[PDB]
């Protein structure tokens, strides 16, 4: 049995009970992680709260060459963490393999991107002529420890986007991996920790969360709460938050909007793409199409062959369909495919389940009393909703109660650019399917589907608390 | 008796059930505004959520020319918005006027800052290659629904940096003016109404607050609380308003840290004029005076002088220092005075208590058992804190709960900025007073003074949603 | 004999000999203008220097206070300025009027940009560990005295285009009005003087291009150059000017690529409407069409059809086809005609002449070997040449020798944004007609179509200079 | 004797006569570089402008790929090119060692810059509701060949900082290395050719100034000059380019203002190590003091000793004070030396020289009437003015023909800002030397001292050409 340990003050601590982390795939004790004791884990703030001063006053290229090194350290170990990566969230192994090193660019990127925020120098003299001799000099400050929670769908590369942006900015950070993906932000902590970075700079906390999980996000250290999950725990942390800064990203009901002049085509290959990478198991997912009735009949046969080409299997077969993350989420599923199916929906694509794995559904013919057509799944399931103008997909996809992402397929322009300042959607994709894309590119959800705005810049930026100094 | 009413929906419409207001001055009845429900409540922000499309849908120089016409009118009738401000928070009748022509010059500015925002139009191939062809054409949208609850001490001025920032963004708003204050907010209601301003996108709410306050502050029509007040009741919005967007503005005690190489005479001065205006019921007022044991007599004297030269009396003979705002306030006031009295704090100024008319107390020799050494009276009473070093002077500014604004009084700008980044504050004034300042520079407060950046430009890119549309420039 | 004078250090002056201005519809004495020796213009120069310090040390506020009144004299003024406009350049009625308006609109746009400026305050710390100390505020300051030589075409907009965006930036300015149209930048002048701008901030130097033309954009006073007109002019000062900086902004022969999925009605009246706009006068407009062979015959009946819409007549009736400038310009643009019609191009529109008055003309059959598919010719001509495939449209697009703008009509945007970027142009206007647009947006030809960008926040950029104030933090 | 190549197409050639290049120090013979002919510079032209559009054509984050393995060979062989750039420019060891790895840091840093540049996405609701639908994006593309062509002072710093800007922009490059300093360009070649950079993006030309110069700079496939010499230069290329964009750094006289409350201890080293660094060849060293009369004499003895414990010698060993580039040079230095020594003007050091090594020279007593007050002499000399007042101090700085940059040496920073905006500089340091700074920050020259803004962002947008892609949303 491996035995992982937490990194708190630059050292490894083990805590007297223990987690152990199983494989979804196969059930096998993959290893096993602490669980800590609220006062194990003000400890880990104190640490932190007591390395701030000394990190913070390092130059930017400093810590930027930290993060370097530590981006280095991981794309050399992609194969070693990726395939324990796979183990325990069920994940195809060159997908595994892949956001490692994708976590490596965007830490790289992070830390250049970090290291170029130029502050401003106001002048007062356009708003009034008495303040025309008062320059302001607006910089921009760390907010001080920073709690990133990441999710289990990715447990290196959403962690990641926490920690680097914050940790460039001069900001310490404490990590709280996910119950199931522990592992693999205990391997990100061990790539930090070779790299060299300072003792406080970067802890992790792993245990429960009855005990530690809504103790440490309701700590006094804790200044910025950066959080990635679902809805029901991101009310919760908005709440309890209190006035103190946060950052949530939750789910979403992402739509593909098809239209008459449409390449449905392209259309079907991008939708299937998005709906089903990683068992649609991912935030930023086609979850529902609305499509013209016009074309539904030709979109849904299309959408029907790309569907039936789709291997399902075994992580380590780099299948297209892996297990999904637990059984209740199975359950979830299946239980939204039995509402859709009782209630008359033609399943377009066999639906069968042998345990945690579940086949792509296909679902056509939705209407708008199936909970498929309403509620994230996280499962391999695709409903397609019919409907007559564009004004009832307009009608139809705002009457979600998310809003990431969208796509909006069709030909004319002038109509997606239409339809995309209709939507009440964070990010309208034309042409192509929903992504949190090149992490330059912003990330958010309106709604009910976050708070605050992701990417490399606006990460780096919202962590961080303007300072005016204002003399003559 | 007059009788006002709240702008819902571009109509004047009154409740069955009113509130009484009495001026602070004399007790004199000033006028009623509607205390009205929830389905009130409700109704108003159904004409506001119906108002946004056709509001959303104008272009900003439209929206800006509205802003344009209001600020005219504000212009116009400074006597009469003035002298019933004046009447309704004990208000200098010169500083009411002021408050207003600053109210104008606000939303003016607001209305040209918000029609020139730009967005980005970014591209993939910088991240990594397989994204070259890839265009975000990233810009700004509006919220929705903006509440706007406002403080006494600025009715007019702090409820028009709610509005106009939200207006010429594509915002709709409602505004809740004070409990105290309501007819000042009403009467920009007015203006606004006057100017011609679409039905439903300006509405005003007024009650008390038992009633439509948590009520429509946590409405599901509601996407973006603003509020200026007191740091509990921030606290209890922050809580209420869930993962909706907020801006809080609370309670600060500025600090003015004074060293041994500073212009004590300027030091006096600033600090005085800060600390006793609007008898000391501002947010960014010097609350505290932090001063080096070397020069720490003299500048007790001068501060003592020129607290001496201050007129205290009636709003309308242009007093500094006017009646506070409540019998409770007044009280409270008392409470910490007495406290410092008790607890053997050297007072440099006369302690007096004429009603609500509290009198300017200079208190020395304070120290950190004192309660006026740390918390916040909105009344006129400066402590001065003795300390032997500059690092202790920046240990006692950063044990503060508040971290709104500070001052550095020195004569090194070197040792002045590193100060200035060693303290735990929003913005630090070098050798001035601090102030909500030129409205376009920023304007926040860590720690328990606020959530949320201010200032016009800030406040526009605050309530607004970022909207990126992909696609491929192929 | 009404008798016009130059602005110099706030008072007028005349000068002993004159030139005198006739209309180029009815060649009527319509007034005369100073004929400025080169002492005078030394003299407004060193009044400008003069004026340049009390000028650069307001407040932004102020000056755009100042932009505001002369805008609003402009807007007082729309139809006597619009109607000596018309007379002197032949203008339509509507079309001088809405010159004027667009001039207040755009002063006033320019006016609150100037008070927008904000530096950046830049840390070294990303650079190297070495300067993490060391903070750099970076602002804009003013160059000094700009010199602008407005064209013919827009006297009042492309002049009010160069001394508004420097005017608010902390510049002196000195107005060269151009030949004709002169009246029209001291009509200009006339309303800055009774807004009341300081005395030598605005200066105007009306003469001859042989007595004071090469001498003022030679002088060691001018620190700005910004000319608007013709590309030999443009070479000629460019070369003239030596290491100060200068804004050109030449000619251009915008070309409209029509595809084969273009809307070919749409298509046509854009491509008229943009070519036939001040009878072909502008520097952007559609000069040629580069339509695909396919669709080549239907969009030349199109083109035909609504070309014999256009109303060829005077001025005051709001003809779209007004007499050309000059007799010189009605004869490089009939020698231009008869080239390309002894070359065997059909001419889908009747070819007449009646004095300066040309009526439009729609080549079709165009080839390479036309004069008229290059040069540039300033009146109603409109070549059509066929392709046949979009590589070669962008080929014979981008053989020109002039930039500035062009427009891709198709209905695939993946394409056109494809063009777009092989397109050496300025600006591409996809499915619309090249303009210079909202004037916020950005306006700059590249090749040897211009140097330097306009628009209003590049050129209030332009004509600053950047200045560094680095100091330690340490 | 090594024979050194040009790189044209990725592949050496030489030409058939060839410049002998002699070591500053010894006269020894250090190698022989290409004297090329018109044509060979009009073949490099072309292959320029065959590599431009694959270059143009493939993502930023490949380019940098190449710009970083370019980083990572110049830091691999530091003591290579080092020794050489000290044996041909007489720079010192350790100092060139420094210049290879500032150069290594500057290239990386552009390469991660370049990534960075983004777009505008503007709308036009703002400036005319008649096109709120109208979208612009405005993104930036190269301008296509650019030509830079370095200093002797630094060779291989001054080269980078041009090459990688704009190689990163997406232009390609061909570098003209200096006369005296080619070796150290074509090692630079050699590292950019070994990195792999693609074949034509970066070329190499050396030969005679009077043959393929000025040829090179008037070619038509040459699209953006950056030059850094000397002004009369200079102003020779600001002439000849004609209309297209240039940048070009020329000449100064860093003024010191040292005032009464001047910490003259820091100062004086500041002053020293400014002045004197390689030998007083740098365009950004402080070339003049100007202290008020009270505090001049002590500042004079602070300076003298500071002076007094500089080394002359070889550039192995590290001496402070190395021979100057040439022969002409060092009899221009003496010239100024031989004026200032004939109108009594106290040298405070002693003159002294052995044919190109020169001994630094403290001069005293200097007046408005000596050469080496208004002449920049390229060598080891500054001179000492004395001043009544602080505005006499500005007064005889702004007297200088070069802007650039300048120190205000004093205690109150409220002064030294109010001396900085009134000093015609590009950057101001307080109670600091002049230097090029961290390369993040803008290095500009406003009079005769150059034209155009560098800094490695500047730079970058310098390079390229504004692209709008105006269209309709709705």
Redesign the interface.
Same mark, same amino acid.
């Given at each position: 049995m491996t035995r992982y340990q937490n990194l708190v003050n630059g050292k490894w601590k083990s805590s007297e009970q223990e987690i152990t982390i199983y494989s979804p795939i196969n059930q096998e004790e993959l290893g096993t992680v602490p669980a800590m004791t609220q006062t194990e884990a003000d400890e880990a703030m104190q640490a932190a709260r007591a390395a701030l001063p000394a990190w913070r006053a =390092?130059?930017?290229?400093?810590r930027?060459a930290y993060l370097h090194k530590t981006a280095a350290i991981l794309e050399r170990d992609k194969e070693k963490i990726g395939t324990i990566l796979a183990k325990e969230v069920a994940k195809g192994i060159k997908a595994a393999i892949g956001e490692v090193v994708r976590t490596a660019?965007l830490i790289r990127?992070a830390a250049?991107?970090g =290291?170029? *925020? +130029? #502050?401003?120098?106001?002048? #007062?003299?356009?708003?009034?002529?008495a303040?025309?001799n008062? =320059?302001?000099? %607006?910089?921009r400050?760390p907010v001080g420890i920073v709690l990133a929670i990441a999710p289990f769908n990715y447990p290196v590369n959403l962690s990641a986007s926490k920690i680097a942006p914050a940790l460039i900015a001069g900001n310490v950070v404490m990590l709280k991996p996910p119950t199931q993906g522990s592992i693999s932000g205990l391997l990100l902590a061990k790539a930090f920790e070779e790299a060299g970075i300072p003792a406080g700079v970067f802890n992790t906390i792993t245990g429960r969360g009855s005990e530690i999980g809504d103790y440490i996000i309701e700590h006094k250290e804790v200044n910025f709460i950066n959080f990635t999950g679902s809805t029901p725990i991101?009310?919760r942390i908005?709440?309890l938050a #209190?006035?103190?800064? *946060?950052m949530?990203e939750l789910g979403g009901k992402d739509a593909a909007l098809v239209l008459e002049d449409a390449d449905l085509e392209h259309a079907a290959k991008q939708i299937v793409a998005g709906a089903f990478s990683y068992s649609g198991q991912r935030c930023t997912a086609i979850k529902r199409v609305i499509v013209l009735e016009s074309v539904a009949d030709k979109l849904a046969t299309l959408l029907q062959e790309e569907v039936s080409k789709l291997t399902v299997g075994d992580p380590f077969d780099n299948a297209d369909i892996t297990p999904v993350i637990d059984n209740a989420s199975a359950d979830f599923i299946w239980g939204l495919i039995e509402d859709a199916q009782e209630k008359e929906a033609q399943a377009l694509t066999p639906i069968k389940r042998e345990g945690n794995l579940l086949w792509p559904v296909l679902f056509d013919q939705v209407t708008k009393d199936m909970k498929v057509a309403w509620e994230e799944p996280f499962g391999p399931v695709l409903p397609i909703i019919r409907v007559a103008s564009v004004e009832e997909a307009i009608a139809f996809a705002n009457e979600s109660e998310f809003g990431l992402q969208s796509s909006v397929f069709t030909?004319?322009?002038?109509k997606?650019?239409?339809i995309?300042?209709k939507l009440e959607? #964070? +990010?309208?994709?034309?042409?192509?399917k929903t992504q949190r894309?090149?992490?330059?590119?912003?990330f =958010?959800g %309106?709604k009910?589907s976050?708070?605050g %705005?992701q990417g490399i810049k606006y990460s780096i930026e919202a962590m961080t608390? %303007?300072?005016? *100094?204002?003399?003559?």
């Open positions: =390092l130059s930017a290229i400093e930027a660019d990127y250049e991107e =290291l170029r *925020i +130029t #502050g401003q120098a106001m002048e #007062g003299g356009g708003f009034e002529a303040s025309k008062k =320059l302001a000099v %607006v910089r400050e991101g009310e908005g709440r #209190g006035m103190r800064p *946060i949530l030909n004319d322009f002038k997606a650019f239409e995309a300042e959607v #964070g +990010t309208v994709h034309i042409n192509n894309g090149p992490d330059n590119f912003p =958010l %309106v009910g976050g708070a %705005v608390n %303007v300072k005016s *100094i204002v003399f003559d």
